[model samples]
Target: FHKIRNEDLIFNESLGQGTFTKIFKGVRREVGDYGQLHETEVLLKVLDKAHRNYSESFFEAASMMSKLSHKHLVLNYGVCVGDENILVQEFVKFGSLDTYLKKNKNCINILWKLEVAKQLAAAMHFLEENTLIHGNVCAKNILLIREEDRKTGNPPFIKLSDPGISITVLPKDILQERIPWVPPECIENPKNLNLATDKWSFGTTLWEICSGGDKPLSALDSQRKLQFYEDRHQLPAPKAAELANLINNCMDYEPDHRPSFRAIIRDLNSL
Candidate 1:
């Protein structure tokens, strides 16, 4: 285990707290010239040992993140476990897509949203091709990094983060929870978690981005949400007709009816 000193961790109170942990903005201390310098700052996610789910979440996050890498996905640097369960990862300056959309509201332009969606789609396509499933694909999990823009001061670059809830395609029961972005079939059956279910969540994320972050299912509460799936065959439809059709096809109640991630990538590319 790598020993992390007090100087190695710095807290940024502004980034706010995660559901199961507190996120601190930090940077790796230079031990030797041979060590690599991270181009951007990093986030130190500190989990509470007292929490019942801490061990499982930490193990899941560490195991999944250690194996995956892509430009569109947030890079996991290292982890520190013991008294403090901490997962160190690259810090995103712009924060989450949900934060941006909520702050900007309708003022946020469509082009930017579409660009983020495309990036997310590309990332999801890559994960699916590699036979990995990002169990959670909500707006809050999407982070944005700033890139130098010749025309503007800086532009936001989208990257998917928070793989703590993610799992590989091996277990069918790992996705038993009622994830907000997942489809009705997922919440009810729970055993149907697969690449197809991920595609459903991805489509909902796309709808949220396209609609300027309007509440996806305003009519349904936690219980009602599941009931909507059970009693009626209704799922979240997109606000726009074109987007509605697109999301509808992806959020097909029948997991088998959903489009493959490859097909989704091709369709997004064509559009």
Candidate 2:
């Protein structure tokens, strides 16, 4: 951990507030901790140390997150000291896919949507290749970055963050809503759950991509209700036949046979 000079970090809008942390749009000065030399836009998630139960959890999460580096994943600058538990992350100017798709659901074109899906799948494949799994995968967890043509020369792209591994210190506000994105084994016996469960979450995210970001596959709320949604699930056709068929492959009830992230990336690129 590194100490942050007050003037080096500037806090901005409150992007989100969880039970134990508040995510804010912030600015970090040139030559920040770990030798990040640019004046960068970042999201500062200040941990509520007052909560007291999460000290170790935050530190562990910071370590796991900082080891990660991918275009689709947010860059974590690790923890900065001066106050308490904190995470300095890359700031995506447009915010999350959940927020963007909502207002522009009807306005955005199909290819644009497909591009976003393609990028995310590619990112997931990269993580899988590296032995990392995004325990949580959803539109809400994918962020949109506004990039100008620069050194990388890449246009604007989307990023996947919130690795989905951690203690549950959050409220009910976001949990139940994630039912559509989660698989049975995860809730039935989290200990039995493995990286493969991400296929289920990826399929649900594909549905969001296909349906222009619609949430809640069904009103089926409870596990029993969710059973019907899962047991007889079929995603509506997206533009590409390969893409639609691949969604079925991912949503298979038996996760042991779902299309691997490698396949998802290939199918998405084919479209």
Clashes of each: 0, 0
RMSD of each: 4.0, 4.2
Sliding window of 10 residues with minimal summed lDDT for model 2: 164-173
Tens-digit lDDT track of model 2 for 1-271: 5555667778988888754677899888867568868888878878786864676765565555456666677777655765466777777788888778777777666566667778888887887777775677888788888633446755558888764325243333344445656665654444544667778888878777666667754555566445655576565665434356766778777769887787777777777
Error of 1 at 227 (Å): 1.0
Model 2 misplaced stretches (Cα beyond 4 Å): 1-7, 32-39, 49-51, 147-156, 164-177, 218-243
Error of 1 at 15 (Å): 2.6
The residue-level lDDT of candidate 1 at 155 comes to: 49
| Prediction 1 TM-score vs. true | 0.82
Best by TM-score: 1
TM-score per prediction, in order, is 0.82, 0.79
